[PDB]
Amino acid sequence: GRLFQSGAEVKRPGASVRISCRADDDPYTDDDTFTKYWTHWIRQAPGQRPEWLGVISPHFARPIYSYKFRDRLTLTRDSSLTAVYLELKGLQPDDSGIYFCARDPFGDRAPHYNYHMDVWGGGTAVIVSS
């Protein structure tokens, strides 16, 4: 359906940002997205194409990182299994942009094994300034 992200952030250089992504804004939901789908994290700085940051697995929340973000990105799932989180540390002014979570079968669903970010969510604007 849709994906629900947290609010826009203003941060200092050298700090960390933490973004949430939910498939249901009900806190006591039983949605079972994030146990069925992979969740991609994708940023877009102004004047640039989208850049892929990482993906988190439905399987036991195993993350695949991009190599240029591996030393300062953490991808987490909630212990209630109903929200996923991005944590970007050591922020710089080129980390500013709109951050998206996207939902993907990712070649893993048993009939057809397709690949599509079919449900995107929102976008959290992240500004890094001093």
Partner: protein, 429 residues
């Protein structure tokens, strides 16, 4: 030339069908409800296309293991009275001694009881006040203490009109044409061993270490490694545990941990250091065939996730073990003594990631020891910067379809198409 109808031609197509179980104290996998077993016919000149990554038998086996698990757990005790405040002290921080008020078989009476809980199964509320870990989100069902978790070999048989083709190519990478094919009635005995990062008690490769990926150039794909010789692993929960029964309702018994008798010690697993290093050299040699001879092969530990996938997670004896494998994957490969891996124990398990369900594993009386065979690995390759001469491999897993893909890779279900037509010089008189 007239057309001629033949019935019973040896023709098949690819198919998906329901397979049934055969199997040669009750169990989680209800093999007592399966069929008795009985066979193998070689098919000369037959080259058959296999794909272990798009195999519907793997998906059916996954659905069957999950359905047998939650069918084994319906009639057992719901631990909804155990969602109370606990007053917990330390036993000596890894174990808590927790006291609580419990219902009895009389609705108007209470009971002050205690139990030993692991730290991984309790969260504090802000001696201190705790509660069980999945108590706000989940209904917890206690596993039934006479029901065994020990994996029993099951066989998957095709119904009538369907066949199971078996690849006998001993160096088969799981995708493509196989030229050595047989027809079987069912598969070999496949033990549903639930495990992460290390394949346990499986079948070995015939000649060499096998490296199998769906696409070895796609680093998001898992790499299944099949060993040719096993590495035995010895695990123990050394604490002498006492189980205590608490009557919590009419006909309802919660099973607590009573006293530890003797020393408090850590659960651990032991691998032979030289045997593990030999197997890692064989894995590196088979792994250099896809990445270059001058590639540095690095083994690092797990990249993240839930505790099931950051550890070697397994069940044996009825306890659920979560073992740090940093001692196993810590090495760089250029062109008597034991490795001792510490393990933690959980009792509140959520194996299939069901939202709002959890299982309480009841405590096992006595000391647990366990001798298994590491027969394979699940690995993940890090994404490289494409100017790199180093490939880093980390222990993967978490998808149990890769555990059962490592036993069903050689198998295939086909549908027999017995009706053929062909030109002949016949004519109906």
């Amino acid at each position: 030339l007239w057309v001629t109808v033949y019935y019973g031609v040896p023709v098949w197509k690819d198919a998906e069908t329901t397979l049934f179980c055969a199997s040669d104290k009750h169990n989680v996998w209800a093999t007592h409800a399966c069929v008795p077993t009985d066979q193998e016919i070689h098919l000369e000149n037959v080259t058959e296309e296999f794909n272990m990554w798009k195999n519907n038998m793997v998906e059916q086996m996954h659905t069957d293991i999950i359905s047998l698990w939650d069918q084994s757990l319906k009639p057992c005790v719901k631990l909804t009275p155990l969602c109370v405040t606990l007053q917990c002290t330390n036993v000596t921080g890894e174990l808590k001694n927790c006291s609580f008020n419990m219902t009895t078989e009389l609705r108007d009476k209470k009971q002050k009881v205690y139990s030993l809980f692991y730290r991984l199964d309790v969260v504090q509320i802000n001696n201190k006040e705790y509660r069980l870990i999945n108590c706000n989100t989940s209904a917890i069902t206690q596993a039934c203490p006479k029901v065994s978790f020990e994996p029993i070999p099951i066989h998957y048989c095709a119904p009538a009109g369907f066949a199971i083709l078996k690849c006998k190519d001993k160096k088969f990478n799981g995708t493509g044409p196989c030229p050595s094919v047989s027809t079987v009635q069912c598969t070999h005995g496949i033990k549903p061993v639930v495990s992460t990062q290390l394949l346990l008690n499986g079948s070995l490769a015939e000649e060499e270490v096998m490296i199998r990926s769906e696409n070895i150039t796609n680093n998001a794909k898992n790499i299944l490694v099949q060993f040719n010789t096993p590495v035995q692993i010895n695990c123990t929960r050394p604490n002498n545990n006492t189980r205590k029964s608490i009557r919590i309702g009419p006909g309802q018994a919660f099973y607590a941990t009573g006293d530890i008798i003797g020393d408090i010690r850590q659960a651990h697993c032991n691998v032979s250091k030289a045997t593990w290093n030999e197997t890692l050299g064989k894995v590196v040699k088979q792994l250099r065939k896809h990445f270059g001879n001058n590639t540095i092969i690095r083994f690092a530990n797990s990249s993240g996730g839930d505790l099931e996938v950051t550890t070697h997670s397994f069940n044996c004896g009825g306890e659920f073990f979560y073992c740090n494998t940093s001692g196993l994957f810590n090495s760089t490969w250029i062109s008597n003594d034991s490795i001792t891996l510490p393990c933690r124990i959980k009792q509140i398990i959520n194996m299939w990631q069901r939202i709002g369900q959890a299982m309480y594993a009841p405590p096992i009386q006595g000391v647990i020891r366990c001798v298994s065979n590491i027969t394979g690995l699940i690995l993940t390759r890090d994404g490289g910067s494409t100017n790199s001469t180093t490939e880093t491999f980390r222990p993967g897993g978490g998808d149990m379809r890769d555990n059962w893909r490592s036993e069903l890779y050689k198998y295939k279900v086909v549908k027999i198409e017995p009706l053929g037509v062909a030109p002949t010089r016949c004519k109906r008189r």
